């Protein structure tokens, strides 16, 4: 509800700050993989790699890409922050793989994948997230190809 | 202070962001995209069709129809009137491609794909009576659709296999099927996610009904099951008791309910409940009702999850000739399909103990929605959620622990969570639990607290180092699983400060532990014995539970 | 008082809509959409193609290869970036199916108008260096389908008539001609529109020759001309010349320009001007070179201007099998084409009279151009536009006042127009106006003069009364004009305030006296008076002048 007054541009500059980032880790928590947030909470209550979580995540992140469109800011801090959310949606699309032993982890949602390789390229068409010595775009694009190498879905990443 | 706003707020067309991922829409593991295939499509027996400017000539191409159906409504209707518009249209197309008796149906299971990426998209604007005439739809299209799920369980002794080995009118409606359940559940999941206001228009007696019919038409009893829908099924229970849960007004939608509709799910769900999970004959055709075991001839992934290895995906792909326009299938024959490695065999099972951990879930989740006591609340889980824990102890004690198999663990974890569904339907729900009932299972879940009340003992572990050897014996696979997670696939897993490997020379040990059936955690031990030691019914007696208690020692 | 904003401006997505356009163009005739038609199309003989991401297999669907590239970089690229993208790599699909023996060239005419398309949507984004490429590449394309535009005037005596009566191959070709001068001319429009400081990307030597060759090619000599690419051709000198005159920076061009362009265009211009048009033989096949007769044979629209009837539009859409894939084309049997109204024949003469209107309007450009004199400022334009403006108002009097066709007023104002085209080469142009061609026409010039001077005598109209009788004999076709007009399509032309049908009543009249050849305009008849009159040349003596002024009476 917060995230919706920075459009209006009343909003303020620590107070914008520690809103996304509770907002961040509001959503890291509920990133989590099965095992550490179990049927505990009633929107990770379904299991199968499919919970209420999945589609209001994928609705907050199209409201902050949204708002990551409305603002304007080339700040040093704001590119840093904005890193962290390319690397919260490669870990939520890391940890609902099925996590084998030496193969690469397939995946259980198409639909995810698409959603998180959409998101990160709208995020670097905008020329999103830059800063110096920085590996985590690196990783994220390391690691979703790590997941795509050879299988069925390099279609899918390419 | 402010920061400042963005003059040109480029907002993406979203009905644009829409018909281009409906354009690119493809599937996993056929060649061309699906509006593509649709292109390859004809139809010459409805020698024309129309119901609301969607013109189809009797040679026409399909999928140009439907790119001229789109793009027309592109320039004309906002997201959702766009939306529902092709709900309508496309089923009202898979409606009279359904009732014909010369027709192939081969592209109902692209429609209905294609349907499905229309509904998932946008659930944000997707409207309710949409989804619930698409519903519908799906529902009385499935028992159209009536015989698939309604092969006999045995063949005859001159059932012969003589046959000329066809496998694509099988693989057409085994599509039309799987897509159809996977619609159900993308449905519900849809209609979760709009808000907890705004369900009585999507629910009435005749949701109720028609999924009560194809329900039981899924979860069958004289008929061969398809694993496939049985997820779906059950995945749907597992939505609505889950927004009567999460909705304030779960009193129209429990009035609406019959318990006729709950008692006649609960007992197939006992019913799955009581079947077993074995690597070596999952993809062997063998005895029914015991072994849920993913058929050869319906194998591929499906629309939300990829639950098997998709074989079938070239077979889709060569489903069309691709360079002709037609409506009957290219040709499959069906043995050609069919070593290397049970790691499939091994997926599948995990696949199959989350599906059980599912049905334990949902019985969770509708003990929380009665609280109080009703028809269904009647004593049956402890019965059955007993005798699932006591075999799943018993023969994982036999059989598992040292079969490095990745799947001990959630194997496991289906004690460790049906423990609480025995706990708390124990503590807060006594009053129904007859005494007839728990004389009916008094061994079993005596025994069942017993198994955890051994490992009070605590003269395994007690260190860090012989523990470490036994996971190397058990529990190499999740080495391999941490390592690669270490070494790839975590952010927090690099330069570990002497604080943080800390937590995992616990972790892992405290799992392996739970592996070995030997040191759980404390807190289910608590509650393994604060039932049996609880007075609320005389499970033992003082002078019987001392019995036990020589059994460890004390 | 300030007009609030939009807060949530929804600007379309300007790819999205010219994908969207791209997708749903269709041009008029055909019954398919473009792409439809493209998708309807394979090519085997080139088994593979890839230029950049662009596979195209052996029988694969190229349209379908198409909108892969087209939603593959829809997501990626700008709007200029997705057109240049487009316009090189179906620039190059379009140069391996041209360069090729075995190989049918069927789509090359959808891709040429797809790319046309592609061009004309944006041009304020459509950039100027791929107007360079793909300009070069249509004008070395027309270098490829040479043939075409050099068939030879006549026959042989055994030329045998005797023939399959093919029509598939020559109505490819045709279009791809036609098509492509379209595209040519598309091409400078757009980079017209391109400002007024950004021509020198574009212009290089290599435009010039290409179009020289292509533009001699074009109005030929020796060979059939086609009247369609002689529209485009002389359009496209038009926008040349236009745009030289609307620079800052004209030198550089024409430093560019060797005069040997000049000199070799004018020619061809002069004998295109020396043509007449007759409604009773354009349809018919006859003498070259006089009749500009748009041959039945090729009779469709184009992608500007609808041109003819488009008798060739189903043929376009009989051109493919349409439930099928293939590069063969489907059968036209060249002579099942073809006596109601001759009023194709009208609006075929009102295009070719808007046509010569365009000749000498270039004249007129390129003098104002060559306000100093040249190579080609050197008196010609006494010559052949005194023999059009002579033979235009001669026979005009003896042919066509009372002929009542529509095409009688743009026909008489061809001559109006010219008069001033005559008039200010006299009077600004005097210095390179030789001694010699004015002798060569001495007769023709100081005639059509007179024809003026001769309707300052003023004893036909004097009133309103008998000069409406005049426009009920010869002027009844504009007063269907402008009672079609006053009835439907005018804001202002309803409950007239008595002052505006006055204006009516003096315009009409003054129109159809315009038509009948006496009573021209005063300052026209000042222009022609101000050129014989004139003591600029001896054009008369006093006592011959008075042979002329007897002629009226004076």
Redesign the interface.
């Given at each position: 509800q917060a995230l919706t007054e920075?459009?209006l541009?009343?909003?303020?500059?620590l107070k914008?700050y520690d809103t996304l980032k509770g907002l961040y880790i509001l959503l890291y928590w509920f990133t989590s993989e099965y095992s550490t947030f179990?049927?505990s909470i009633?929107f990770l209550?379904?299991?199968?790699?499919?919970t209420?979580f999945?589609?209001?995540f994928q609705?907050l992140i199209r409201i902050v890409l949204?708002v990551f469109?409305?603002?304007?800011?080339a700040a040093l801090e704001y590119a840093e922050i904005q890193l962290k959310y390319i690397?919260l949606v490669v870990?939520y699309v890391?940890?609902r793989t099925?996590?084998?032993?030496?193969?690469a982890?397939?995946?259980?949602?198409?639909?995810q994948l698409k959603f998180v390789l959409t998101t990160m390229?709208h995020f670097l068409?905008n020329k999103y997230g830059l800063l110096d010595n920085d590996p985590t775009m690196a990783?994220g694009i390391l690691?979703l190809y790590?997941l795509c190498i050879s299988n069925?879905?390099s279609?899918?990443f390419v | 202070n402010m920061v400042p706003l963005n003059p040109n707020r480029i907002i993406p067309d979203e009905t644009s962001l829409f018909l281009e991922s409906i354009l690119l829409h493809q599937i996993i593991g056929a060649d061309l995209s699906t509006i593509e295939i649709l292109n390859r499509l004809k139809l010459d027996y409805i020698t024309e069709f129309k119901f609301k400017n969607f013109v189809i000539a009797k040679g026409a191409p399909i999928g140009k129809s439907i790119v001229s159906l789109l793009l027309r409504c592109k320039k004309t209707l906002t997201l959702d009137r766009f939306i529902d518009t092709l709900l309508e249209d496309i089923a009202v197309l898979i409606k009279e491609i359904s009732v014909h008796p010369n027709e192939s149906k081969l592209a109902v299971p692209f429609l209905v794909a294609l349907m499905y990426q229309i509904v998932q998209f946008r659930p944000s604007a997707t409207h309710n009576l949409a989804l619930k005439d698409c519903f519908l739809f799906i529902c009385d299209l499935i028992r159209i659709y009536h015989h698939v799920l309604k092969v006999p369980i045995h063949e005859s002794n001159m059932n012969l296999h003589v046959e000329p080995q066809i496998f694509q009118y099988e693989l057409i409606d085994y599509l039309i099927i799987s897509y159809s359940f996977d619609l159900l559940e993308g449905i519900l999941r849809v209609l979760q996610s709009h808000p907890k206001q705004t369900y009585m228009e999507f629910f009435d007696e005749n949701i109720l009904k028609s999924f009560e019919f194809v329900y039981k038409l899924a979860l069958t009893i004289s008929y061969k099951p398809m694993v496939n829908v049985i997820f779906s099924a059950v995945e749907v229970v597992n939505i609505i008791t889950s927004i009567i849960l999460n909705m304030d007004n779960s009193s129209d939608l429990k009035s609406l309910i019959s318990g006729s509709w709950w008692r006649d799910c609960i007992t197939r769900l006992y019913a799955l409940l009581e079947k077993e999970i074995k690597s070596g004959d999952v993809y062997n055709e063998n005895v029914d009702t015991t072994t849920l075991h993913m058929s050869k001839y319906h194998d591929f992934f499906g629309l939300i999850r990829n639950i098997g290895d998709n074989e079938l995906g070239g077979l889709i792909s060569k489903l069309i000739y691709t360079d002709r326009l037609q409506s009957v299938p290219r040709v499959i024959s069906k043995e050609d399909i069919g070593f290397t490695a049970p790691i499939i065999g091994y997926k599948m099972e995990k696949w199959l103990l989350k599906l059980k951990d599912e049905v334990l879930n949902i019985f969770e989740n509708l003990l929380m929605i009665y609280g109080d006591d009703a028809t269904i609340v009647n004593g049956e889980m402890l019965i059955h959620s007993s005798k699932f824990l006591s075999r799943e102890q018993a023969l994982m004690i036999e059989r598992y622990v040292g079969q490095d198999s990745p799947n001990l663990d959630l194997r496991c974890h289906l004690i460790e969570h049906t423990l609480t569904i025995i706990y708390r339907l124990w503590k807060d729900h006594f009053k129904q639990l007859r005494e007839e009932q728990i004389k009916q299972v008094e061994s079993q879940l005596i025994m069942s607290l017993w198994r955890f009340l051994v490992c009070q003992t605590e003269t395994v572990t007690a260190n860090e180092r012989e523990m470490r050897d036994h996971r190397h014996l058990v529990d190499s696979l999740h080495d391999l699983t941490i390592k690669d997670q270490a070494s790839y696939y975590e952010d927090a897993f690099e330069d570990l400060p002497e604080y943080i490997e800390e937590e995992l020379k616990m972790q892992l040990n405290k799992r392996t532990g739970r592996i070995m059936q030997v040191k759980y955690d404390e807190k289910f031990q608590e509650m393994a014995r604060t039932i049996l030691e609880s007075k609320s019914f005389d499970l033992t007696t003082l002078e019987e539970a001392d019995s036990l208690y020589i059994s460890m020692g004390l």
């Open positions: 920075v459009l541009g009343k909003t303020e500059l914008f179990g049927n009633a209550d379904s299991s199968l790699g499919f209420k999945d589609f209001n609705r949204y469109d409305s603002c304007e800011l690397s870990d890391c940890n099925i996590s084998t032993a030496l193969d982890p397939a995946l259980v949602c198409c639909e390229h068409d990783k690691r790590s069925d879905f279609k899918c | -």
